[PDB]
Enzyme design. Structure first.
Site, PDB file in Angstrom:
ATOM      1  N   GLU A 357       0.954  -1.222   0.026  1.00 53.87           N
ATOM      2  CA  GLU A 357       0.044  -0.118  -0.064  1.00 53.87           C
ATOM      3  C   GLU A 357       1.116   0.862   0.175  1.00 53.87           C
ATOM      4  O   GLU A 357       0.115   2.284  -0.862  1.00 53.87           O
ATOM      5  CB  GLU A 357      -1.346  -0.053   0.599  1.00 53.87           C
ATOM      6  CG  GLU A 357      -1.735  -1.383   1.668  1.00 53.87           C
ATOM      7  CD  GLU A 357      -3.682  -1.264   0.375  1.00 53.87           C
ATOM      8  OE1 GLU A 357      -3.079  -0.133  -0.042  1.00 53.87           O
ATOM      9  OE2 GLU A 357      -3.605  -1.968   0.211  1.00 53.87           O
ATOM     10  N   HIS A 360       1.756   1.731  -3.775  1.00 55.30           N
ATOM     11  CA  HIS A 360       0.597   2.746  -4.237  1.00 55.30           C
ATOM     12  C   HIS A 360       1.248   3.908  -3.579  1.00 55.30           C
ATOM     13  O   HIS A 360       0.354   4.245  -4.667  1.00 55.30           O
ATOM     14  CB  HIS A 360      -0.960   1.828  -3.582  1.00 55.30           C
ATOM     15  CG  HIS A 360      -1.390   0.686  -4.643  1.00 55.30           C
ATOM     16  ND1 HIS A 360      -0.699   0.418  -5.740  1.00 55.30           N
ATOM     17  CD2 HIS A 360      -1.846  -0.129  -3.880  1.00 55.30           C
ATOM     18  CE1 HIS A 360      -2.149  -0.822  -6.262  1.00 55.30           C
ATOM     19  NE2 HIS A 360      -2.115  -1.330  -4.788  1.00 55.30           N
ATOM     20  N   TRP A 459     -17.676 -24.071 -20.588  1.00 51.36           N
ATOM     21  CA  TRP A 459     -16.997 -22.955 -19.469  1.00 51.36           C
ATOM     22  C   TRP A 459     -16.315 -24.511 -18.187  1.00 51.36           C
ATOM     23  O   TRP A 459     -15.191 -24.652 -18.000  1.00 51.36           O
ATOM     24  CB  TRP A 459     -18.436 -22.485 -18.169  1.00 51.36           C
ATOM     25  CG  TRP A 459     -16.829 -21.787 -17.053  1.00 51.36           C
ATOM     26  CD1 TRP A 459     -16.747 -20.472 -17.334  1.00 51.36           C
ATOM     27  CD2 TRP A 459     -17.326 -21.371 -15.980  1.00 51.36           C
ATOM     28  NE1 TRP A 459     -16.180 -20.191 -16.807  1.00 51.36           N
ATOM     29  CE2 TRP A 459     -16.589 -20.503 -15.263  1.00 51.36           C
ATOM     30  CE3 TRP A 459     -17.704 -23.343 -15.236  1.00 51.36           C
ATOM     31  CZ2 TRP A 459     -16.411 -20.632 -13.750  1.00 51.36           C
ATOM     32  CZ3 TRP A 459     -18.011 -22.843 -13.577  1.00 51.36           C
ATOM     33  CH2 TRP A 459     -17.216 -21.841 -13.450  1.00 51.36           C
ATOM     34  N   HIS A 487     -15.530  -9.794  -7.994  1.00 54.71           N
ATOM     35  CA  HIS A 487     -15.269  -8.693  -9.315  1.00 54.71           C
ATOM     36  C   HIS A 487     -16.163  -9.043 -10.052  1.00 54.71           C
ATOM     37  O   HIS A 487     -16.863  -8.431 -11.153  1.00 54.71           O
ATOM     38  CB  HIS A 487     -13.682  -8.742  -9.679  1.00 54.71           C
ATOM     39  CG  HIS A 487     -12.593  -8.961  -8.808  1.00 54.71           C
ATOM     40  ND1 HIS A 487     -12.692 -10.289  -8.083  1.00 54.71           N
ATOM     41  CD2 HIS A 487     -12.249  -7.715  -8.544  1.00 54.71           C
ATOM     42  CE1 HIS A 487     -11.196  -9.620  -7.193  1.00 54.71           C
ATOM     43  NE2 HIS A 487     -11.400  -8.389  -6.985  1.00 54.71           N
TER      44      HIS A 487
END
Ligand SMILES: *[C@@H]1O[C@H](CO)[C@@H](O)[C@H](O)[C@H]1NC(C)=O
Ligand SMILES: *[C@@H]1O[C@H](CO)[C@@H](O)[C@H](O)[C@H]1NC(C)=O
Ligand SMILES: *[C@@H]1O[C@H](CO)[C@@H](O)[C@H](O)[C@H]1NC(C)=O
Ligand SMILES: *[C@@H]1O[C@H](CO)[C@@H](O)[C@H](O)[C@H]1NC(C)=O
Ligand SMILES: *[C@@H]1O[C@H](CO)[C@@H](O)[C@H](O)[C@H]1NC(C)=O
Ligand SMILES: *[C@@H]1O[C@H](CO)[C@@H](O)[C@H](O)[C@H]1NC(C)=O
Lengths: 596, 198
Positions: A357, A360, A459, A487
């Site tokens: 982080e 980041h 799939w 997501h």
């Protein structure tokens, strides 16, 4: 006067008002995240509505300036970014339906609670409980029950919603001059107008296949080794010639294989590199963790954290009275305000997360000089990759010995490197076929290659072909098995992890070559090297002003994504896995041999 | 005051003690152009112009001769042959409020660059395009003055900085802003060098 000057003044006014509004929205979101209260939720909703309305109005007004009469690359890039319709091109009824579908999917995923039939007095949610059950259980039928029950409830609820979602998103994308929603997602990596550094939307799928074809032998050997170890753990369920059972991969969906490290350890007799006890003995606070991370970043030559970072960040859990989101997140609020929201514990994982982080934060600080609409990564992969390289460097035994967290008399032999590399492969290599298969399936769904009645039959066929994972029982078309992941259900791109994983090792090789490291790639530390930091900062300062191909040329010297650094990183482990797989059979069969 | 409507105070007929300002630790920038701070306490000038305004942290560099930027081109312009000192200090404590302090504005656009020591307080809609603005902030027509939303939690490059620029000029009139004169303990009955009243 001219169109270009008009666009430049419009961009200047837009940037100025946008930065203030984005700051207000980001601050409201921060106040909600560190303080979950209803007034903070109302303030967040008001700020988000104002931000969205402002983006709609500037998108409406930006389109009146034609793109072809502007020659400056930065101005054209900002105008291209602003002129996207988004959902505005679609009709109001369909836009409202899409927003309602997204909100209800968010509520269904977030508040989805499933428990065993005949005992319904209390039930467990996925994030508090089902994750721990999937990560720690050794029972076949319990994991099978949790997996099948959660996919039954979530898929049966989400299947009509997903059927509407694909049609609405395809309609919006084709209304926006894209082939499908997959092309809209692939448009992030599209470079147009730069001589030599142009990248096409169609080239991305070919590059992903070309890299994955070289990924496949290492993944096949790792899959064979994991299959053999799971056969040792579970004697009769796993077949020597077939795929792995779906519910035994250590996570709910198969995203990571990091929870199988205990079962698949090469050398259990040897000790681990756990440094948690050393920090507990020396009373290392989270503040000390972030100060050591800051010392690491100043060692490589990057700028140190601001005073406002130390004053305004929340690096400890506030208390019982005040509620906060526990997920570690780096916030670039705007106007030079950088914060980290992490409920930091005294663990190795939190220490690596702190480095990630702060990477980041460093990336956010680097492009502060850029205009507001270009203050992002060149693509979605770079932003995560620059944190992941810090996560790689901080985890090394050399870094732990240098900062005093590891004993100076720890023996670094080949066995510890092999087991550490296997753990890193289970975390990093294992997610690549799942990511590639999921993104390719979603692209085929958006493109119309797969009809709605044949979504699952293809799939599972893909999963056996690519991931080497077999379904426990056959699933019909009433299930919606992909949308159980966070997501995909909440309209997020998934190729960022694949690009991040390749860019991570490419950046790692480039910085280690810059830092003149003389050993194995996984034994490399980028501390104390000013030139490596300068080479990184050259790319970091650009932000979104330049193409990602040019940024990759700046760092690694290549104009395209490359697969060789990952294979170079895991080469000792690759040789060890090849040695260990002499008796066993590498590769899998797509037949129903283990269980169906 | 705001950077666009910057306050100018003409200082005349008094004693200016510059050592009190120079030796203060409260100022972040004390960059003098055209004269050195050490001999300011001795020299004498006809008039002193004290221009006061508030800008951002990153915009302090633009208050100099020969520089460029929004502040120099459209808000406050210094001559190349400038004699004086630029003093800037952080004012996050006073000029920032938690909600956002919108009382400070800057001129964002103008057709031409400002002349040195010019003040523009016009509130006419800027015309960036061929179309007439007609007093409405529509397409291609924007409002010149924009606020700086000063908040205490900002970065050091965005925090409010109070800037005072002292301009020293010499004119044919008798110079009356003179530096303080220091006087010693009088010694009598000895052959000494006296300098009574110059
Ligand atoms: C969190 O919200 C509560 C709600 O009233 C408030 O009393 C408290 O001061 C807030 N704390 C912080 C640190 O913002
Ligand atoms: C493009 O615009 C930026 C700012 O808008 C400017 O700094 C740059 O010099 C311009 N480039 C060209 C080639 O005109
Ligand atoms: C946005 O939608 C409008 C409405 O049809 C269209 O005229 C415009 O060209 C679209 N913008 C782009 C960049 O295609
Ligand atoms: C960052 O480094 C500079 C120079 O090394 C130092 O003066 C400054 O205090 C540091 N920042 C913080 C927050 O300590
Ligand atoms: C580690 O090295 C020793 C001696 O070089 C060797 O005997 C052993 O087999 C090696 N182990 C691995 C896993 O490479
Ligand atoms: C990096 O520099 C610091 C400060 O001199 C030093 O303590 C540390 O040991 C260095 N790292 C290595 C790996 O030598």
């Amino acid at each position: 006067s001219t169109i270009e000057e008009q666009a430049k003044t419009f961009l200047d006014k837009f940037n100025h008002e946008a930065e203030d509004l984005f700051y207000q929205s980001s601050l409201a979101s921060w106040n909600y995240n560190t303080n979950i209260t209803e007034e903070n939720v109302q303030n967040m909703n008001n700020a988000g509505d104002k931000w969205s309305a402002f983006l709609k109005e500037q998108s409406t007004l930006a389109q009146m300036y034609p793109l072809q009469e502007i020659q400056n690359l930065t101005v054209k890039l900002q105008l291209q970014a602003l002129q996207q319709n988004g959902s505005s091109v679609l009709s109001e009824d369909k836009s409202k339906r899409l927003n309602t579908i997204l909100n209800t999917m968010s509520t269904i995923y977030s508040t989805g609670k499933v428990c065993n039939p005949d005992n319904p007095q209390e039930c467990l949610l996925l994030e508090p409980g089902l994750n721990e059950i999937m990560a720690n259980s050794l029972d076949y039928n319990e994991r099978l029950w949790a997996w099948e029950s959660w996919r039954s409830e979530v898929g049966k609820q989400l299947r009509p919603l997903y059927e509407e979602y694909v049609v609405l998103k395809n309609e919006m994308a084709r209304a926006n001059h894209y082939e499908d929603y997959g092309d809209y997602w692939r448009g992030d990596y599209e470079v147009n107008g730069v001589d030599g550094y142009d990248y096409s939307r169609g080239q991305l799928i070919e590059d992903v296949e070309h890299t994955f074809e070289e990924i496949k032998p290492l993944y096949e050997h790792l899959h064979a080794y994991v299959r053999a170890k799971l056969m040792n753990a579970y004697p009769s369920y796993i077949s020597p010639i077939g795929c792995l059972p779906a519910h035994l991969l250590g996570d709910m969906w198969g995203r990571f294989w990091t929870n199988l490290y205990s079962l698949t350890v090469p050398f259990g007799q040897k000790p681990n590199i756990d440094v948690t006890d050393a920090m507990v003995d020396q009373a290392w606070d989270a503040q000390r963790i972030f100060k050591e991370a800051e010392k690491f970043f100043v060692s490589v030559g990057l700028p140190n954290m601001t005073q406002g970072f130390w004053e305004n960040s929340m690096l400890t859990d506030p208390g019982n009275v005040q509620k906060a989101v526990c997920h570690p997140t780096a916030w670039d609020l705007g106007k030079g305000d950088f914060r980290i929201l992490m409920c930091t514990k005294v663990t190795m994982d939190d220490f690596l997360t702190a480095h990630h982080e702060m990477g980041h934060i460093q990336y956010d600080m680097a492009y502060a000089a850029q205009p507001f609409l270009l203050r992002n990564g060149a693509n979605e992969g770079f932003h995560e990759a620059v944190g992941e390289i810090m996560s790689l460097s901080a985890a090394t035994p050399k870094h732990l010995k240098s900062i005093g967290l590891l004993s100076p008399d720890f023996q670094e032999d080949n066995e510890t490197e092999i087991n550490f590399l296997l753990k890193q492969a289970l975390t990093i290599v294992g997610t690549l076929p799942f990511t590639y298969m999921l993104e390719k399936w979603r692209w085929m769904v958006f493109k119309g290659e797969i009809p709605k009645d044949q979504w699952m039959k293809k799939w599972w066929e893909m999963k056996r072909e690519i991931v080497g994972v077999v379904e426990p029982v056959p699933h019909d078309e009433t299930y919606c098995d992909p949308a159980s992941l966070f997501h995909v259900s909440n309209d997020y791109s998934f190729i960022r992890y694949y690009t991040r994983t390749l860019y991570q090792f490419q950046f790692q090789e480039a910085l280690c070559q810059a830092a003149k490291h003389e050993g194995p790639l996984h034994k490399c530390d980028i501390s104390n090297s000013t030139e490596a930091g300068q080479k990184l900062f050259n790319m970091l300062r650009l932000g979104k002003s330049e193409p990602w191909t040019l940024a990759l040329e700046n760092v690694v010297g290549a104009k395209n994504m490359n697969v060789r650094p990952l294979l170079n990183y895991f080469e000792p482990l690759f040789t060890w896995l090849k040695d260990q797989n002499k008796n066993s059979f590498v590769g899998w069969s797509t037949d129903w041999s283990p269980y169906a | 005051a705001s950077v666009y409507a910057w306050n100018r105070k003409r200082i005349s007929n008094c004693v200016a003690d510059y050592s009190v300002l120079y030796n203060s630790a409260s100022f972040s920038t004390f960059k003098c152009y055209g004269v050195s701070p050490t001999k300011l306490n001795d020299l004498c000038f006809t008039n002193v112009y004290a221009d006061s305004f508030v800008i951002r942290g990153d915009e302090v560099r633009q208050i100099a001769p020969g520089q460029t930027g929004n502040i120099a081109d459209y808000n406050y312009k210094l001559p190349d042959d400038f004699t004086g000192c630029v003093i800037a200090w952080n004012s996050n404590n006073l000029d920032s409020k938690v909600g956002g302090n919108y009382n400070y504005l800057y001129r964002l656009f103008r057709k031409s660059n400002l002349k040195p020591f010019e003040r523009d307080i016009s509130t006419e809609i800027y015309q960036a395009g061929s179309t007439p603005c007609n007093g409405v902030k529509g397409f291609n027509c924007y409002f010149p003055l924009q606020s700086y939303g000063f908040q205490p939690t900002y970065g050091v490059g965005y925090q409010p900085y109070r800037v005072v620029v002292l301009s020293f000029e010499l004119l044919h009139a008798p110079a009356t802003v003179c530096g303080p004169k220091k006087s010693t303990n009088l010694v009598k009955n000895k052959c000494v060098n006296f300098n009574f009243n110059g």
